[PDB]
Design a protein around this nucleic acid. Structure first.
Ligand SMILES: [K+]
Ligand SMILES: [K+]
Ligand SMILES: [K+]
Ligand SMILES: [K+]
Ligand SMILES: [K+]
Ligand SMILES: [K+]
Ligand SMILES: [K+]
Ligand SMILES: [K+]
Ligand SMILES: [K+]
Ligand SMILES: [Mg+2]
Ligand SMILES: [Mg+2]
Ligand SMILES: [Mg+2]
Ligand SMILES: [Mg+2]
Ligand SMILES: [Mg+2]
Ligand SMILES: [Mg+2]
Ligand SMILES: [Mg+2]
Ligand SMILES: [Mg+2]
Ligand SMILES: [Mg+2]
Ligand SMILES: [Mg+2]
Ligand SMILES: [Mg+2]
Ligand SMILES: [Mg+2]
Ligand SMILES: [Mg+2]
Ligand SMILES: [Mg+2]
Ligand SMILES: [Mg+2]
Ligand SMILES: [Mg+2]
Ligand SMILES: [Mg+2]
Ligand SMILES: [Mg+2]
Ligand SMILES: [Mg+2]
Ligand SMILES: [Mg+2]
Ligand SMILES: [Mg+2]
Ligand SMILES: [Mg+2]
Ligand SMILES: [Mg+2]
Ligand SMILES: [Mg+2]
Ligand SMILES: [Mg+2]
Ligand SMILES: [Mg+2]
Ligand SMILES: [Mg+2]
Ligand SMILES: [Mg+2]
Ligand SMILES: [Mg+2]
Ligand SMILES: [Mg+2]
Ligand SMILES: [Mg+2]
Ligand SMILES: [Mg+2]
Ligand SMILES: [Mg+2]
Ligand SMILES: [Mg+2]
Ligand SMILES: [Mg+2]
Ligand SMILES: [Mg+2]
Ligand SMILES: [Mg+2]
Ligand SMILES: [Mg+2]
Ligand SMILES: [Mg+2]
Ligand SMILES: [Mg+2]
Ligand SMILES: [Mg+2]
Ligand SMILES: [Mg+2]
Ligand SMILES: [Mg+2]
Ligand SMILES: [Mg+2]
Ligand SMILES: [Mg+2]
Ligand SMILES: [Mg+2]
Ligand SMILES: [Mg+2]
Ligand SMILES: [Mg+2]
Ligand SMILES: [Mg+2]
Ligand SMILES: [Mg+2]
Ligand SMILES: [Mg+2]
Ligand SMILES: [Zn+2]
Lengths: 102, 252, 58
RNA sequence: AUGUUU
RNA sequence: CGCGGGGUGGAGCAGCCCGGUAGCUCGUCGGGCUCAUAACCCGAAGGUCGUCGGUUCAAAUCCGGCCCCCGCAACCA
RNA sequence: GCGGAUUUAGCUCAGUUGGGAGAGCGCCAGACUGAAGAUCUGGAGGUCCUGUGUUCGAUCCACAGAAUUCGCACCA
RNA sequence: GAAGACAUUGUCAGGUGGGGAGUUUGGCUGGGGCGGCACAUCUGUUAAACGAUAACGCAGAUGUCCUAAGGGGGGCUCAUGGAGAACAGAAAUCUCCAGUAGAACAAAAGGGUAAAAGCCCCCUUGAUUUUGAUUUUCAGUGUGAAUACAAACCAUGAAAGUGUGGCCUAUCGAUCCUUUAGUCCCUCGGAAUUUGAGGCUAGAGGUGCCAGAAAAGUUACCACAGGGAUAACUGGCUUGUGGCAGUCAAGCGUUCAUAGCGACAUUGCUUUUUGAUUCUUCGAUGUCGGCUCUUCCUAUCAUACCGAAGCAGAAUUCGGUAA
RNA sequence: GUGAUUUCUGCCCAGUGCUCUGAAUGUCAAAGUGAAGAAAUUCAACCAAGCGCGGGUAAACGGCGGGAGUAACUAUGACU
RNA sequence: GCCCUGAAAAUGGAUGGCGCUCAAGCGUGUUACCUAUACUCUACCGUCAGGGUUGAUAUGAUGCCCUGACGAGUAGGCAGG
RNA sequence: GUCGAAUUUGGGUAUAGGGGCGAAAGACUAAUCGAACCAUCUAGUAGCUGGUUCCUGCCGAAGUUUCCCUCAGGAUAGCAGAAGCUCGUAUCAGUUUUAUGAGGUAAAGCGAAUGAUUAGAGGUUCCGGGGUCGAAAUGACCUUGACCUAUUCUCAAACUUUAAAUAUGUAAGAAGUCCUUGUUACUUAAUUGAACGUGGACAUUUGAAUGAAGAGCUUUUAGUGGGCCAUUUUUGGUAAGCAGAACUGGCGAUGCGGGAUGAACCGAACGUAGAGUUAAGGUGCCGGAAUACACGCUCAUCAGACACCACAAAAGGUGUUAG
RNA sequence: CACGGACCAAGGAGUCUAACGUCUAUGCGAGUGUUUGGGUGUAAAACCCAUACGCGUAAUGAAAGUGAACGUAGGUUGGGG
């Protein structure tokens, strides 16, 4: 799919609360932190003997992920998140379609 | 799933050596003042067969230098040693077959037997029938002797380590075919319970890594890593190479 | 071992043992899905009607 | 350096 | 996911490790030499550097993306 | 009988992105040779495995059938 | 004597480690396995004109694709056929006429659509925000999908209006954990500030066995609980296949359909074939063949007596009563 | 491992093993080092063996092709 | 239409058997007759339901009495013994 | 078989259970070995097999829905019991009628769309054009082909204009109808309307039929979650006492009379008795009941003799009967 | 022609407990529960008892926290009595 940037859409920043321009980027998860309580508990549980103490998923079936657009209001900076339908090729860049051309 | 035969050998229950008929440990004299500074003369009283050993032993009687009595020693007989012969052991003994000399006191090219690895260990190297060590040189500073061992290895030994002039008697022994399971039986009856040997490939998987299969076959490479563990080290342990040896030895 | 997959056999008999029950019509039915604008104004209209009918007892 | 057969 | 490395005429390629400027051999086309081929000689053709974007008086080389390949290492929905 | 596969000038094949059927080994013709083989130059060579179907067309986007094979076909 | 702050030993760390330990190694299924997916789903049909409705029924489809192929508005009309224009012919571009859709609308199929839902053009982001109700599946739970509103902010158009993704029917995902966005709110419990962590609300990372364990084989050395819910024998139903037999009569039989045969068809019988099924037996009906022995059937090889012949004799062939 | 004697043990190190090489070499743990921070901590550099890179080895495990044409009858193909 | 040919299987055997031929067979029609735990009436048992009767000697008001209807049953539930 | 050495054997001694020992069979290790024996953990767990102890009375099932690593199990809903509760001028119903819808099956149709499909006939020579002449053009023909026109034979689960029967939604009143006018922030240009009210009028049939051991309501629990059979509709299969669906009725769970016999068929469902009458089925004898009455048909050297049901076909016969 | 049962006697299988759901009975009732313990006793009984504690009388929110009368504790319809 091809999704454009700059997204004039609704903003909930409590100052705009209205349709404003939003810069569009793709959501990237972000590094899993140590000291998150789940990670701390998992490390404590994995320490010592006993082997693997929690499941490790193997039966992968999805061939795509749901792309998330981070929509950032250009004036108030509040971010919103929009999920798109599953796609295999996602481009944020332009190069719109042309009709009647070669 | 079972402990394999080479693992069971280490417990040493039925795998200990059959030492009843043996004459005693074959050793040089204790390295004492007389051998450190001059020589001591003993006499060969008997050349006798040792059970389980190929080479004959020589019972050599020396006088005790500190107490009026005789000290019998069990040497490995070198070829040409005879009963009634005077054996001389020490720094100042002559270069004659059967004499015990420090490695430093013998010229390059000398053939010695029952060579000490360390001075005073009373004999470690070239003890089997027909085997010998060759002095290939000396390093007087940092006093040492370079020697050629029966296996072809070059070793540097202290120049104070002793050896017996000549070659261990009983040589050529392995040139005669045993010709008979019975003769192999009687050979190992006086050495240890290591014969006969069932092939691991003729066993079941529980008994041996090579066991099992609808045909007798190893199934995986018989060359086993040096870092393998007990129960895995069956076959060609840490083999650098396999197959028929073609070409020359003595790599550089 | 394969087995039966589905049948509606005996289902109508089971349902008619305790009978198909009409759903107990009520006056003043619920206003659940009714247009919230209409409902918002209906609340005010009813409060005003209640106040008027109360005051009308003089 | 290569160059067959009649 | 991390850390590295590589992608250049048809092919292998040097070129990059701080722009002065895309080359080497084979293969392909022509001629010469030979009695004729091979080697050889003289020519001629073949790329603008895997694809984008950026720095820079002027970037294959710098800088970051994307694709492909490889090596090691990592693995709680 | 199931799961795969590949069918294209005489032989081996490249194919084909909704073009247009091509390259070798053959064959023919012409060169070179006293001549033959070798070698060079060319030229033809298929109604694209078959019928019907989507189609502007489409062996090639596409449907089923065939041919040649492989692999499997077990516990009794 | 050798050796030396190195070995060694202790702790932690990385590698190696079926030598050994523990465990696992789907389900449906005309037995199981192999195959397939009928496991989560969508179209048409089966389906018997409300709804619902099965099979490893039938013909197919889904894990995508699209910043337009979403939204609004305007203008136009499609497939095809005929008639015409230099190159230009069957296919190029131009023109008229007919044209109920015989086109197109991403994909499967079905429905729907003509001043449109199709084609072209213009502007856009309603594919947005909040949290409820509702319909299908349904337990009237969840998930997915969809419907109609409300409260905002927008888009488009002159406007009425229309728009909360794709004309409709499929195109997808819990807890825990991680992560992001938001609220800048709540908590860190002796009292504060700042980091850090933990909460609240909404998403994302995924379970396709699709209400969602983390999982390789082999056993002809085998074990246990069971199963006739289920295979390998007989028996029973069936008779496709096998075997046997009719009816018709185009032909063969030099002539001549039927002495003897007999195509194209068609009606049966049998259960000495093999299938199909899984009803009996898995707390056990001894599982090939032969040997031995008895009896039964007749669809008769011989023997008895006969009818027919392409029966001269002889031999043979067809057939009847006959076991 | 093979299995008296006799005769002989062909080719293959691509794969899986085993083995030899080693600061020129990518990756690579704890400790240690540097930076930033108020610190927890984060980041970076360095980082042993192993693996990778290079070699050897089959009396290690093992493995060891297909199609077409072609000879004064056919047939078969020495041959390509 | 009926009958016959078509019409062959294995222990000896089956319109149920015997046997039946203007049938005791086939088609059809009319009556009479036989008999189920069914129907009708009555009695008795129980269950359920609706009632009467604390006005006394009257002790069974969970009692006494009146009326009608009903009664199959695995798994299972409950009740009275 | 072997019998003078890898010989046989006594005693002593060593090796102990994931251990030993094995000239190797998973052999042997005290009748125990693909992991000994003893005791304990331990009454190990079992969705699996077996059993589960008195009587009578009343009521009385399910093998279906959804979900599950589920398919021999459970949860869930349903079916069942029990306890009742609120009322009973009363409520409703596996039914009809009237009124009003909805459907796309049966049938039907194809000189109606789509798709199949048989044939001849008119045109189109621009028919596809060939042949043949035509010096040649299609120019004449001949002709095959196609198209077009009007006809013709036959068809469709996934075709259709039409379109049943059965089944199915709703309504048939007092929570109704009519008249007046109060509230509102909704709605309208507007007391316009919408919704909810106030006040007023209308009880014999309060607005079809029939019935109503009453109606409504609640809680809580059992068992069940293998089903099978019959008619009819119907799918796969040659078919099956096969496999799978729909509606109903049954069997399971059920005796009784009948079908000799038999889970399901016919009849009829059951407290203990008596009398009468019957059902289905029967009435020669077995055997209760007419060797009844009446009209015909049939003679079988395999007669026939009551549905389910325990079989027979095509084709034939101056047998006989009637047309 | 599925399994157990040759026979007989005796034994022989839904128990108790912790915590609970519904229903019912009883006591008291915005309260209720004496029995941890104390007093007492004819001594494991019966009798008596303080302070607490449990549940209830308040909910809601993750939490900080806040916390139930417009009114005759409301209007309408039905409602036994
Ligand atoms: K652990
Ligand atoms: K051996
Ligand atoms: K093996
Ligand atoms: K291991
Ligand atoms: K296993
Ligand atoms: K048959
Ligand atoms: K069995
Ligand atoms: K190799
Ligand atoms: K190798
Ligand atoms: Mg650890
Ligand atoms: Mg050996
Ligand atoms: Mg063996
Ligand atoms: Mg092993
Ligand atoms: Mg191994
Ligand atoms: Mg074997
Ligand atoms: Mg079932
Ligand atoms: Mg010549
Ligand atoms: Mg293991
Ligand atoms: Mg299975
Ligand atoms: Mg329907
Ligand atoms: Mg329009
Ligand atoms: Mg769905
Ligand atoms: Mg709107
Ligand atoms: Mg829509
Ligand atoms: Mg998710
Ligand atoms: Mg969290
Ligand atoms: Mg604290
Ligand atoms: Mg599921
Ligand atoms: Mg069975
Ligand atoms: Mg047949
Ligand atoms: Mg069955
Ligand atoms: Mg038996
Ligand atoms: Mg028997
Ligand atoms: Mg016969
Ligand atoms: Mg041999
Ligand atoms: Mg580190
Ligand atoms: Mg290293
Ligand atoms: Mg007959
Ligand atoms: Mg009779
Ligand atoms: Mg009669
Ligand atoms: Mg009676
Ligand atoms: Mg009463
Ligand atoms: Mg009863
Ligand atoms: Mg074995
Ligand atoms: Mg027990
Ligand atoms: Mg009953
Ligand atoms: Mg699951
Ligand atoms: Mg069972
Ligand atoms: Mg239909
Ligand atoms: Mg029809
Ligand atoms: Mg069950
Ligand atoms: Mg049952
Ligand atoms: Mg019955
Ligand atoms: Mg019968
Ligand atoms: Mg009688
Ligand atoms: Mg007939
Ligand atoms: Mg039987
Ligand atoms: Mg049993
Ligand atoms: Mg028994
Ligand atoms: Mg008893
Ligand atoms: Zn903003």
């Amino acid at each position: 799919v091809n999704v454009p940037k700059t997204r004039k859409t609704y903003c909930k920043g409590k100052t705009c609360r209205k349709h404003t321009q939003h810069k569009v980027t793709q959501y990237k998860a972000g590094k899993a932190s140590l000291f998150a309580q789940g990670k701390r508990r998992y490390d404590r549980k994995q320490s010592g003997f006993g082997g693997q103490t929690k499941p490790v998923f193997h039966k992968k079936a999805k061939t795509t992920k749901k792309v998330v657009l981070r929509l950032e209001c250009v004036k108030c900076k509040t971010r919103a998140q929009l999920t798109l339908k599953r796609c295999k090729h996602f481009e944020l860049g332009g190069e719109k379609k042309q009709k009647g051309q070669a | 799933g079972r402990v394999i035969r080479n693992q069971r050998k280490g417990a040493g229950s039925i795998f200990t050596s059959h030492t009843r008929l043996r004459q005693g440990a074959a050793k040089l004299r204790t390295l004492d003042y007389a051998e450190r500074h001059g020589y001591i003369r003993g006499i060969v009283k008997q050349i006798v067969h040792d059970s389980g050993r190929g080479a004959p032993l020589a019972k050599v009687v020396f006088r005790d230098p500190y107490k009026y009595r005789l000290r019998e020693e069990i040497f490995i007989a070198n070829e040409g040693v005879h009963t009634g012969q005077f054996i001389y052991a020490g720094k100042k003994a002559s270069l004659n077959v059967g004499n015990v000399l420090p490695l430093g006191s013998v010229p390059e090219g000398t053939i010695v037997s029952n060579v000490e690895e360390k001075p005073g260990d009373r004999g470690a190297l070239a003890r089997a029938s027909g085997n010998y060590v060759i002095i290939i040189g000396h390093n007087p500073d940092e006093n040492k002797t370079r020697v050629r061992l029966p296996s072809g290895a070059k070793k540097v030994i202290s120049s104070d380590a002793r050896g017996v002039i000549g070659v261990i008697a009983g040589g050529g022994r392995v040139d005669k075919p045993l010709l008979k399971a019975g003769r192999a039986f009687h050979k190992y009856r006086l050495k240890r319970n290591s014969w006969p040997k069932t092939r691991g490939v003729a066993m079941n998987p529980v008994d041996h890594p090579h066991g099992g299969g609808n045909h007798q076959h190893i199934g995986k490479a018989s060359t086993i890593s040096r870092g393998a563990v007990s129960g895995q080290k069956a076959g060609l342990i840490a083999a650098r190479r396999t197959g028929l040896l073609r070409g020359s030895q003595k790599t550089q | 071992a394969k087995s039966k997959n589905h049948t509606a056999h005996n289902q109508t008999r089971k349902a008619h043992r305790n009978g198909i029950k009409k759903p107990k019509t009520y006056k003043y039915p619920s206003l659940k899905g009714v247009d919230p604008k209409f409902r918002r104004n209906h609340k005010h209209a009813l409060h005003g009607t209640a106040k008027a009918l109360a005051a009308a007892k003089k």
